[PDB]
Structures are given as structure tokens and as C-alpha cells.
Design a protein around this nucleic acid. Sequence first.
DNA 1: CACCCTTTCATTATTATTATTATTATTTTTTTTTTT
DNA 2: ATCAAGCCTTCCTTCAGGTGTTGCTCCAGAAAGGGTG
Lengths: 324, 324, 331, 155, 103, 182
Amino acid sequence: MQIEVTVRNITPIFSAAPGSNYITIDGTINPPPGVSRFPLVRTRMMYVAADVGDGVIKSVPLQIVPGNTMRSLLRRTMLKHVIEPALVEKGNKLSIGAYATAYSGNATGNPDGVPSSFDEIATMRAHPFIGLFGGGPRMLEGRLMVDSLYPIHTNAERILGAGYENEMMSGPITQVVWARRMDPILNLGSSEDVEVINGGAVAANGWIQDLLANSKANGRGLKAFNAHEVVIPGLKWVWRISLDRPTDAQVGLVLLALNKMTNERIAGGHSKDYGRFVIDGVSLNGEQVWSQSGITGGEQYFDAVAEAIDGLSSKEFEQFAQSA
Amino acid sequence: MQIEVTVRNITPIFSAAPGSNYITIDGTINPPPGVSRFPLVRTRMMYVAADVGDGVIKSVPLQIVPGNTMRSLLRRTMLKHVIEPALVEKGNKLSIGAYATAYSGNATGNPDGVPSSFDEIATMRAHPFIGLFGGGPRMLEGRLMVDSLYPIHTNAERILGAGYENEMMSGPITQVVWARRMDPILNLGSSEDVEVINGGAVAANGWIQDLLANSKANGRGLKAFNAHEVVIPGLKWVWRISLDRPTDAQVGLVLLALNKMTNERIAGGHSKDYGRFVIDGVSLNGEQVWSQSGITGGEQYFDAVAEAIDGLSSKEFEQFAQSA
Amino acid sequence: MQIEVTVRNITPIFSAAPGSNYITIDGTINPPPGVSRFPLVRTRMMYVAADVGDGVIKSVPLQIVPGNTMRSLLRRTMLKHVIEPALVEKGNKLSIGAYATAYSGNATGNPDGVPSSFDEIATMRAHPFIGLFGGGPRMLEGRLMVDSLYPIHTNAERILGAGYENEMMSGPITQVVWARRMDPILNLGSSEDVEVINGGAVAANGWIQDLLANSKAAASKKKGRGLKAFNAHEVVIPGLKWVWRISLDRPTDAQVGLVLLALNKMTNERIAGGHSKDYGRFVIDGVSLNGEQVWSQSGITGGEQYFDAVAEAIDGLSSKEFEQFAQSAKE
Amino acid sequence: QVVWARRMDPILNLGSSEDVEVINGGAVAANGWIQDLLANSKAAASKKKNGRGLKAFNAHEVVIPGLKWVWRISLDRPTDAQVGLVLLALNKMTNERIAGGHSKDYGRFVIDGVSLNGEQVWSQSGITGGEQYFDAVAEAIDGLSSKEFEQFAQS
Amino acid sequence: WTGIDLSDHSLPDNPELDRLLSDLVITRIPVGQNRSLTHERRTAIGGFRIISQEAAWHFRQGLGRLVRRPGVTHKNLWVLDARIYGGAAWVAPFRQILDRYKK
Amino acid sequence: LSLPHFIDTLIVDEAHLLEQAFASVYTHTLRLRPLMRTIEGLDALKELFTQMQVATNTSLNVPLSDVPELIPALKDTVKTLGALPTKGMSRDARSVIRIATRAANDALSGHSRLRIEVTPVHSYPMLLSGRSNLQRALLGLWNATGGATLVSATLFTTGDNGSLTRWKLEVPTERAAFLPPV
DNA sequence: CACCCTTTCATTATTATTATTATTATTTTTTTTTTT
DNA sequence: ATCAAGCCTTCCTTCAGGTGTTGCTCCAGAAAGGGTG
């Protein structure tokens, strides 16, 4: 079962690529030393083979949001607005391990050596939340295959073989966004502002001297300057959600998580409002089901997840999490 | 009988290589100790003779998925998509030993070092599926030979004989992909989030303090940050499948699984949808028989396997798996 | 004829080395004991005197295919593609001892030390196939003499005199390839997957309980063999250039023609092993006949006298010579 | 270094109907061979707790290739034709082998040098120099006759 | 090192009194003295065998400056590289040319 | 024209330099300062020098693995040097223009290596397009030779071992013969 | 005649071993020539 | 034309005790007899 979630990003997308990268005042990502490099955390990039010129395929950059990131995102919306309301309406109580395994695939960092008995595999695989995301102490396989967010871009013409041939962006899709820290005690100005600090003006003054003693001279003070590379907004992305012999309840759960997908953020940089997005279209095995009012279609999936929400107990999450 | 199945992976290929590889914050792999060392799980690589300076051939790395794994993927597609539907379609039921001997090479890790009788060997090497995949307790040799998947890369230009020179790509084909698993109990946030947890916030708080205990010092917490090296996506691969004097049913079974092989993941990284691929072409002893809808031509092989799956019975598999 | 053939393996070469070798998870061959070790089946190695540095002449390991191996391969290609086709288009047929003599050299073990007639020795060494592979119970000296497969390598510089300094590799030449062997019913996930197994869930869960009981037995032994066996085997890397020296002490033209027709059938043949993993496929990129390059991409395009001689000797082929070759004097 | 060699049964290595039509008796003859091998295996297994089969796994230790060997050829007051004969043998020796092991093609070699009383005389294309030896052996082999061999033999 | 005629042409008929070069001194074994593209490629193929080989060639060409014609006398050769008199193996070829002289 | 198309017998004295001769004729060098003085009597070649600055081994044995801005500057150098008016150009200046355009067009193909060098007199910029594989040229030489004599004082490594020098000038081993030295 | 072939005799009676040991990692900076 | 010129902890966890066949075979003697060309 194949799902293709085509979205447009309202705010810019920052999913931080690990790597202490550096930036100058105008471009030159990771310059040579002595040009006064500034710290730079770039957005997550996937190298991708692409048709660069006629007959030549090169490994080129393309900035993505990771499939692991949005696997955990889909699992998170699934659990916060469907699963947790079900377990509050029936009063079912999860354990610490059951909660942590339902959100993270494991209760501890040690998976168990034994494999689960086949009845437990069949019952858990049949269960929609467990089937979509496996794991646990006995390392269950899940039915969900969450692919990364590629933009609809020339670097992904080799990726989008079927469909999405139009709406192709030629140029780069990143902008460097600069954030500075400022010290408020440097910027306060007035003593009527410092009448709310206990200790008066002399305490604020003494902190100014601490920072002056740091300015002459490794406890970090304040007032840093940073840049972070972001993916530019308004561009169409594609999400691929593949399923592995799914029950109708698992697909209905995915569509239940998918309808509210917009409230959440496909990114990091929470405070900067990075990750806001609107779903342009959703296709089940290629068929378009998406409307402005969520998903229009797939009624057997919605009915199956309706009957699977009912009778969903905590004990499924408890038994799977419990280590041998 | 020689088959050249050119595929293109859509999402990144990750066939993990055994070994304790480590990665720093940057691209450095297996660094000198004392630095921040994060565990890397590299893709399976093979060394090839390649002209690094147009006369000097040196064993360069090139990332592959092994033919042992490729044989299993081809075996599993035929086993799940052709063999088992024909078995339950005529009601034929295998024992668990014959089931393991269908999926693995035999049922028990001990083989009897006993010759199987000739008539037995002739029936099984005339059997389509069991002729493809030998083994069993008496250790039959198959007729199927699966080579590892190879991209049309300039490192494999000595592997790739002819007809693939234009398709060859150049440069690095790998990307390190970072993965994190935090503690979602650290990302809990509100008192309405802990009500699903039994005992509530204090119990959640209890988990937190063990984390702080595990901060100050074998049980392992949830929070992990690591990396896995993958092949890039959208690259063009080639696959060699050789067939030793094959009967018509055996080649037809090969064409059946490959044609329906699109719905399948090249093994490694299921949750991140890593194994997804699309088959660009299938050269059938040098003749291109692939289309967008599957294998056109090859009509006698599809016919012979169609008259083979009519008449598949359990007793051949049972006599294959029966130890002397 | 002093035939020299260079074959490019386009997949790995795995002629397994007998022994009990181990490897750690990292990739160190034969580790000191106490560390977690997995069985490694190395490729065939010969020690070779070679030039490291300058005049510091040393035994280095060079990874080969045995001469006995590729000799058997040469026999099987000619037997499969020239001899037995030309033996069954006519009415001739072979006894099981004479098939065993034509393939394994001898119809059985326990050879008769009673020798063989001089007219017989002369007629078998004038034969196209028997003079090449002089087996039999009375042990002939076959006139086909087959080299080990050498990679054109800096460690084989003393083996290969001149003309091979270009297209010649150096350094490490192998790769350890791992295999998992995953137990299949651990992959079982639903009632749809389990319907072909007799009993379905009960038999699957019973084998699961057997596996966990064997796991407790293994934990008791550390502090009946399952289907999880994760191991390693070392292959020679693909794309290497190899040299193969066929030698024929005063051959009949039909006999070297049989070698050349076998070489024609050399393509779509497997060198060493690893038949499940397609190891040992290769392409010939050169054939030299007394040093004269006689290989085009279409085929031989040369050695024509040997070709018509082996042609005339394979319509003249029959089973009488094979049967009187395999006939044992005591039996 | 130990080089291992296994002979195995090729009636174990059959397996197609096209593989067996070349057999006198065919399928039944091959299966009778199989049951004979089975009975021999059970007889051997009961013997451990004389007709053998074809499977044979053995070893032979060989000297490593590429090694330089020396070879001292001392002629106790020779004639000139004798040294010419030894030199022609050293010229034409390249097509012949050492120590047997013919099937494995062991003993293949190349002559690096030939020092005649300590002065190097070997070339890549034979022996350059010693022309009096070559002339003496040329007159001798023009003069070669089997009657000398017969008078050395019989009388 | 290579390609210089240090014989007197003011003394054509008498090489016994030729005295243009009485002393030749080698301060260092000529390793790495050729850095052409073809020779660097050949070094990359063969390894250190090409470098030690070409170093021996440059060493014999530097040693060829002493004698240019028969009949000269009292020609002094010196080598001052300490690897000549050490026990290192890779400088072994520069022994045997050195072994063709005595005392 | 200069020599017969087939040489029936070729004898080469001072053999050990012959290979270096091929390495000199298949190497085309651009010298920047004489050109820069000749045009005064373009700005893109100044940018080409500034780009050659950014790339103690400075771009040794690298055909195209470094292209910071080397090929747009090379194409601009080719067009700005080839389109200058030949009328009014000095009879000794057009030689400098032609040797520089031949070096630039030898670097245009990508079939040759690149290497920068400096002069002994000063740190002047030197661009070179030499070739490290000379098998086709030397094979075409030995095809046009019926028989040849390898002559030099320095041909053999140890004894009569001329495999190194046979691998210098790409002599066919079927045609090679390493005679005992004196 | 020389040569070429087939079958007689004996009854021995333990059986140590070589315990040696086996798969790599080193330099380094010229400035020529006499061609289009 | 200049400053602020990145901060903290993440730094793995199970599974992988490989098992079967191969475990050698011949001959290394000269008589004296009988049937041959």
C-alpha cells in the first residue's frame, strides 16, 4: 500500500543537519580559517544522483526533511490526537515502558535477545499502532515505511519517475537566516527599568563588569551571533508512506493522523515557527483523496480505524513493551 | 541464461556492513580516539579493480547490496507472490521444515553429509523453484546464480562489460545519515500528557530522575544519537542473474517474481523506506524485455511457469526437506 | 602450444581454503581467543616469492584458483560442450565407470598397478580428450598441463616475466563478505503469512519455543543446531586480471583444438565456487598461442588447423576408446 | 605450503535428465551407483565403530613458486661436444618440467642465468657464447649414429 | 649528475695524464630525482620498485662521470651517504655497483 | 614528410632520453607573463591567474578533479586570445599567441593532465598540459619501425633486465630483446 | 632359436611421526630540451 | 569601516555458541613355463 502526501510549506523548513559548519558575512559556507567564521547549522541535506547535463548523472545536493524525523512525527500526531484520546475515553493506563515504547519503539536501550512468539507477532502486527511502528524489547517489524521529504526539484527528477513532472524548481532552495543574541542588561538603559531587579542598579552594573572582564579575556556569557541555513518556504514537497500488507485499520490510522497533519511542524526550530505546511494532495495507491476538509475518500479505512479505536486497550501496549 | 536487471533505487540504499565503524560530528570516518566518536553503520562495500589513473588499476570501494541478499529478495518475491498463492490456491500445505527449506536453504542448520539419490536430484533440478534454489539437508545445488547489485559507476567499468558506458555515474555515491532517539518522556510537556501514563506525572517524574541518575554515572536509556552510511537515491544499478542450463519453468518463475518485484524493498532500512527501487530494464540474454507494465515478450517462459504453478504440490517440497 | 589466457572476473572469486579460520566483527583475520569470533572461509592462497622493496625477496600470500581446480574446469567445459554433445548426437553411450573415468580421471579408487599396453598408451595419448586427461585405472600421463589462475599482481611479478607490467594490480586484493542466514519463521508476521505451514500458528509457535529452549541451552553451555548462522567468507575482488597457462607436451593438433574449443565454451562458465552468489563468472580478454594473440571479442579467429583437426577428431569420436580406457585390468 | 586437492564423485555432480542420457543404463545405472555409495558409507561408518568410492580429499606440500634455484653441472674432463650437448639441453630445457606434478602443471620454470666456469653465458634467447661448444656438438650430432648406442648396449 | 663530459679534450692522445676530474663525491643517494608525469604514474603503478630502480639508474649515471675513456689513472670515488654503510635493506642495490670497485 | 612513414631500421643513440623526448612533445605549456606583456604591446586571464592561485604539491597529476573556475576561464582565454586581429599583430607576437592557444586547447580536451610550475627566476605562473600515459604514441612509433636497436649506456636495471626501460618507451614485448650488456 | 608372457614363495606384526608453529605498514621535491 | 564572532548532551543495543564429506589409493619380483612366430 503506497501513499504520496504532496505538501506546500508555509513557513521555512529547518531540520538541522549535524556538523559544525561555518559561514562568513556573505556566503562562503565553511571558509578557510582566519576570515572570522560564524557557527552555522545547515538544514538536512540528502545527496542524490541527478541528470545534470545530457548523459551525465552526478551526486548533487538536495535539502530534505528526514524520513526518520517524519516517521516519528506521524507516530507522534497518531498518538497524541487519536491513541491518547482513546486511552483517556476508556480510562486505559499505560506504563512508563508502554508509553516510551509507543512513542520511541523501545522501553530501554537494551533490546531483548529472544524473538517474540508468533501469536504475539500476529496480534501486534494486526494491531494498527504496533503494526505501523514495531520495535520493543523483542524488536518487532513494523508495516510502515516512511520515506524522506523531497521537494519537487530538478535534483529529484530521478526520484519522481511517476507523476510530479511539472511544478519543478530549477534554482537553489535554501536561504541563510541569521539570528543574533542580545544581552538585555546591556540594552536596558534606565534605572526605572532596574527598579524591578532586586539589588538595584549596582547588581546589573556588576554583571556588566563580569561581561567586560570576559570581553578583555571559558564560561560563555551572552550576545552570540549565529546563522542557520533554511529551506525556503512555499515550495512543494512529496512524502512517501509505504505499507507492508496492511490491515485496513492501520491505513485508517495513517489517514486519521494525516488529516490533522497541518497542526504540526515538519521541522526543527520550534520557536521560529519553522515547519508550518499545508497538504496539497494525498493519493492512496495513486488515487487522489485530499480536500480542504481533510481526506475525502477511503471510507473503509476510516470505518476500520473506527472499529479498531473501540476495544483498543492498554494491554497491547503493555505486553509488547514488557521485556522477557 | 543471463539476465541483466537494471533497477533504479528511488530512496537511499542501506545494506549495512558488519563492523564497529565510528563517525565524528563532520564527515570523518573512524577517527583517532579522544574525539567525539559516534557509531557509524556503513553500507556494504566491495573493492573493485578500477583505473584510478587510466592505466593504474586499484581496488577502490564501491557500495553494493550483496548477491546473497539479492538472491533472498528474488527468492522471497517468488515465494510470497507466486509460490504460496499457488499452494493455498490448490490447498497444498507445507510442513514447517519444508517452509524453512523454501525460505532459507534448509530446515536445520545441520546438514546430513549424505548423497541424495539421482532421481531425487533430477526432479528437484527440474522443479522450477527448488531448481532455482538448492540446499536442503542433502545440499542440492540450484540453477540460479545471483550477483550483487552494481551501479553503472566508473568504479565498476571493468565489471560492466559493454552497453552501459553512457549510463555510468562518477564520484561519491554515499551519504552519512544521522539518527536520534530521544526520550519522549523528556518531551512530555503538560499534565494532560501524563494522564495516559499510569500513576501520572510523579511516575513520569520518577523516570526523569533515573535519567538524572544515569546522567551522573548494563541498562541503557532511550536517548541515542548515531549514524548510518547509505548509498544516495536515484542512482542507476545493474543486477546479473545467471541460470545454469535452466528449464523453461525456472526462467519463467524468475520473470514472474521480477515483473512483480517492483513492490519490494532491497533489504535494509525498512522503517525509513530505504529499499524502494524501480526496474529501468531487464535484458534477457542481451535482449531488452522490460516495459513500464513489466516484462513484454518472453511468452514461452511465462507460459511454462503458468503450467508449472498448476501442478505445484507439497510432496516435492516435503521430500526436499526430509533429512536422510 | 604454451597457451596463455587472461580472464577478467566480473564477479568475486571464491575458491575456499580448507582450514578453521575465524574473524572478529571488525575484520581482523584469526583473532586472539576470548573475543567474539565468527567462522571465516578464506579464498585459496598460495605463498609466492616476490619482490617487496628491492631484493628483500619474500613469501607473500597471493590469492589464486588452484591448478587442479581450473584443470577440472577445463575438463568439464570440453566434456559438457564438445565431447558429450558429439557423443550423444550419435548412438554412442558411456558406462558409469567410463563416465567416472572421463570426469574424475578414474572409475573408482584402488588403482591397479598393472600397467597398460604400449599400443594402448600411444592410442590414448593420440586421443583428443584422453591424451589431455590421462586418468584411467592404469594411470596415464595426460599431456594437458594446467596452471593455477594468477592475478596479474605485483606479488606475481616473478611468475609473469614481461608483458604484464601494465594492467597489473598491487596492494590488498581481497574482501571479506558476510552472510547472515536468518531464521525464516522469525520473519512470520500474520495469519496470512502462516497459512501454508501445517497447523499454521501452532507449529510456528512450537518451533519458536524450540528456538528459545535451544537459546537457554546455549546460554547454559556458555555459562541440535538452529537456523541462525552469521558468518564470513573471504573472496578475491572482482574486475581483477588473471593469467592461465595451459601447457601441452607435443600435442596433436586435435588436442590443442579441443583446448581452443573448450576456451570458446569458457564464457558462461564459473571459475571457483560460490554458485549461489554468482561468484566465478568471468570474461576472457586474451588468448595467446605460442605468444601469438589469438582472441577477438567474437571468438578465437585463429588456430584454424587445430580447429579443423579437433573437428575431424570429434566426428571420429566414439565410446570404444573411453570404454577401453576405463576398463580395469583386475576387474 | 600445503596445497589441498579433492577428487569427488561426478555421479554426485549430475542432476539433469540431459545430464544422464549419456549413461549406459542412464537413470537406473546412476541410481545404482548412488545406492552402492550409500551402502559403502554405512559399511565404513559401522567399520569405524575394502572397495572405496571416488571421493578423496588429500594434501600435498609444495615448494612456493618464484624461488631461485641453483644447479651445479660438473663435467669431469669433458670433450667439447659434451659441453655443447649440455648447453643445447640448457637451451631447449624451457619446454620441460621438474619434479613431476604434471597435471597441476608444477615445475614450470624459467632460466635466469647460466655461468660457465663462473662467467655468465645465458641469454633470454638461449646461450650466447660458447660457439666452440655449439660447433663441436653440431659436428657430433651430424655424426650421431645408433650403432654406437648398440655397441654400448649389447656386446 | 647525467650528461656532462668531464674529460680533457686538451689531452686527446694521452689519457694517462688526464686530470680534469680527480675526485668524484656522492653526498646523497639520488632518490626522487625525476618527477615527470609519466614517471609519477609509473611509480603509482609499480610502487617503490620504480623509485629505487630509477635511483640506481641516476646513481650509475652520476658514477659514470669518473671514467670516460680507458687509460686514465688514480681516479677517486667517494660516497658520503650514511645509508651506504648502514644495515638498511632498501639501499641494497647501491651496494652491488659499489661492490664492483675494491679497496 | 619530416621522416618516412615507415622506418625499416631505426637506431637510437642515448636511448634513456628518448622517452623523455616524448614527454616533452606531448606536454603543452602556457606561460602567462610573456603573453601578458605581449597583449600590452585581457582581464579574463588575470582572473584565470587568480583562480590558479587557489589550487608543497600544487595541482600535480590532476586532470579535472579540481575545477574552481578553471574551465570557464580557459574557454574565455581561448576566445579572447583567438579572436584578436591578426592584421597589425607582430610577426613574433603571433607565435606567442599561437603557442598559448595551443596550450589552452590541449587543456581543453581533458585527455591530458594539468600541472602548475614556477620559474627559477621569479614566482611567475606556469600552466602545463602534459600526459602521463604515452602508450598510444610510442606504440604508433614502434608500429612504423621494422627493426630497431636500443642503445645507451644506461638501459638495464640488474643484468639484462630491460623491463623497466621497455615499460618506459612502451616497447612491445613480442618485439623486445634485451641484449647482454658490456 | 631368441624373445614374450603368466603365476609361486613369506607370514613380519606394530606403527614413532618435525611439535615445527602459521597472512604488513618505505621516498620525497628536479628545471630540462632545441619540436610544431 | 565593527561587533557578537555557539552554546549543552547526545558519544549505542541485542544477534551471530556454523555445521556436514573429506580422515587415500597403487607399484616398485624375478623366477620358470608354454605357446608363439
